[PDB]
UniProtKB/Swiss-Prot annotation, chains A, B:
It is found in: Cell membrane. Homodimer. The gene is opd. Has an unusual substrate specificity for synthetic organophosphate triesters and phosphorofluoridates. All of the phosphate triesters found to be substrates are synthetic compounds. The identity of any naturally occurring substrate for the enzyme is unknown. Has no detectable activity with phosphate monoesters or diesters and no activity as an esterase or protease. It catalyzes the hydrolysis of the insecticide paraoxon at a rate approaching the diffusion limit and thus appears to be optimally evolved for utilizing this synthetic substrate. This is Parathion hydrolase. Predicted to be exported by the Tat system. The position of the signal peptide cleavage has been experimentally proven. InterPro entries: AryldialkylPase_Zn-BS, Metal_Hydrolase, Phosphotriesterase, TAT_signal. The modification N6-carboxylysine is found at K135. Zn(2+) 2 binds at K135, H167, H196. It is a peripheral membrane protein. It comes from Brevundimonas diminuta.
Length: 327, 327
């Protein structure tokens, strides 16, 4: 009923339309403070983020969950500033993604548990801002360290009730390995979202996880490099599957009785330094709507395909509410 | 005429006895701010660092060059606080070591040149504290990215006059490849220190580089894991060669007429998170003197072996002053 946001505790009824997997900035630990000029300036990044979230709010969005971890360069002070200026609730994250520095990668499962617990129970850095979600990641078969992160995430979740959201290489069916590891720790499937699931057309994989109680993250609907096959870097990241094909997976899962298991988002950002230099400009040209892509283009598309507004309201309001609530 | 420290510009004479390769904290970008409890607390680390530097000061040290780069988790505000309370000048560093995150590893030579220049000319983060040295690294044959860092370092040094200091896998003769890359950029050998040179006994390698005008960094004299062969992690880090063996390389270069090419240090720290958890405790047990090891143990050892006082004063005061001075 009460979740932690970057502005403090709010009631779950106030969350409303929620985008479950977003980023204010896709960067690296300490990078934004050390080289803000990469993004023009910190002020330019703040202004871009505020304009984007205000446009998303005008379109219907009330809350975004920033799944940026320590290693994605999460700066909660930036999240707080943007949240207040745009009047959009932002849920901060803990956990580790696939670029942890030596000081993180050499740690034991017990040490990582205390770090994730510190960020949820005490606060992130010296801000007092508490995390409301744990972000973990695997890119194919889990490395010994990634297995420790998954276990530590599960132990932190059981102690606080806070949910776990994942990054997967969906074509490699990573969700199954993640699921098995979470369940070996006693974590309930209802507290986990298997993300980047829209990167695959394998419905047998998605429905099986959904049947076990897992939340399915169809979280990168506008990600498409169709038309830009000459740009090798944009093709490798955005993929060659259309926004429509990704959006039709939402309909496919509703039609198989799993409307309560779907979580939708854009996996968008306002700053991107962890890849090639031109990537943010390339991405903004592909999708000028940004985070507003879900209520402006995806919801009307699904209404046109036959999905009722009540089901779409259930996926964007009711589902994230149940997922984010500490249980 | 003036060297930039964490407390502002100082004259050449104010530098005095200088330790050319040290660290206040050996960590990772953003780590100290995100998990200060790893070091007990930030207050505990500051207090330990201030005591250790005051110990070094009473023994003769007036300046240390903290070669902690962005990726070693350099926190210039921590450096400034410790410097003020201990009354020991600290020269901060720019550059990149062997743990760059995605946002750094994906950058071009031009972009990295602008980052290093920003840290020398403008300042580090939002502190206004300017770096007075560029730290780079290779661990065997240079990787494509490490070659870009060395080139960017050379271009940054040529525009500012600030020197370059390196980390080497000395047994692999890395200094020769580093030298070839620096010289191809038009960088003068007198502006470069080939560090970790005390990790090898190959005198023909050290003398050839010294004859070419390079400064030889015999920078980790107390590093020895003799007596603790049971500790796999400490053995792989510190090595099996004695401090005496490392210190006899200073005498060996003085005997072959390269007194002017020697830079001595401890490569010590007060906090260490980029390795195994108990490493700082193990290191403090091996060498309780810390940064005071050079004037308390190495200087009297060399005095007993036949090296005169004016020669040792030349290595510890004159050589660093000439190296650090922007030329
Ligand atoms: C490879 P991944 O989909 O995690 O990349 C993310 C893209 C959005 C910013 C954070 C990184
Ligand atoms: C031999 P290496 O430079 O990796 O070890 C250092 C120890 C002090 C902190 C920075 C790292
Ligand atoms: Co991801
Ligand atoms: Co993401
Ligand atoms: Co080193
Ligand atoms: Co060092």
């Amino acid at each position: 009923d009460r979740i932690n946001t970057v502005r403090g505790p709010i009631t779950i009824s106030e969350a409303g339309f929620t985008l479950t997997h977003e980023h204010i900035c896709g960067t690296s630990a300490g990078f934004l403070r050390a080289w803000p000029e990469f993004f023009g300036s910190r002020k330019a990044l703040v202004e871009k983020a505020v304009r984007g979230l205000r446009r998303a709010r005008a379109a219907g969005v009330r809350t975004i969950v920033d799944v940026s971890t320590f290693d994605i360069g999460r700066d909660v002070s930036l999240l707080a500033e943007v949240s207040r200026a745009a009047d959009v609730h932002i849920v901060a994250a803990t956990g580790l993604w696939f670029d942890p520095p030596l000081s993180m990668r050499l740690r034991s499962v017990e040490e990582l548990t205390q770090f994730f617990l510190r960020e949820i129970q005490y606060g992130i850095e010296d801000t007092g801002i508490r995390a409301g979600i744990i972000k973990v990641a695997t890119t194919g078969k889990a490395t010994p360290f990634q297995e420790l992160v998954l276990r530590a995430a599960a132990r932190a979740s059981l102690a606080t009730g806070v949910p776990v959201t994942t990054h997967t290489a969906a074509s490699q069916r990573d969700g199954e390995q993640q699921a098995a590891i979470f369940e070996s720790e006693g974590l309930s499937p209802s507290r986990v979202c298997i993300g980047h699931s829209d990167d695959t057309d394998d419905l047998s994989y998605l429905t099986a996880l959904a049947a076990r109680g897992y939340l399915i993250g169809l979280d990168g609907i506008p990600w498409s490099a169709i038309g830009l096959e000459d740009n090798a870097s944009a093709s490798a990241l955005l993929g060659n599957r259309s926004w429509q094909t990704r959006a039709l997976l939402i309909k496919a899962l509703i039609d198989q009785g799993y409307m309560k298991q779907i979580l939708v988002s854009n996996d968008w950002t306002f700053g991107f330094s962890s890849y090639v230099t031109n990537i943010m400009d390339v991405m903004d040209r592909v999708n000028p709507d940004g985070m507003a892509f879900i209520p402006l283009r995806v919801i009307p598309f699904l209404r046109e395909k036959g999905v009722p507004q009540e089901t779409l309201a259930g996926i964007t309001v009711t589902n994230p509410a149940r997922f984010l609530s500490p249980t």
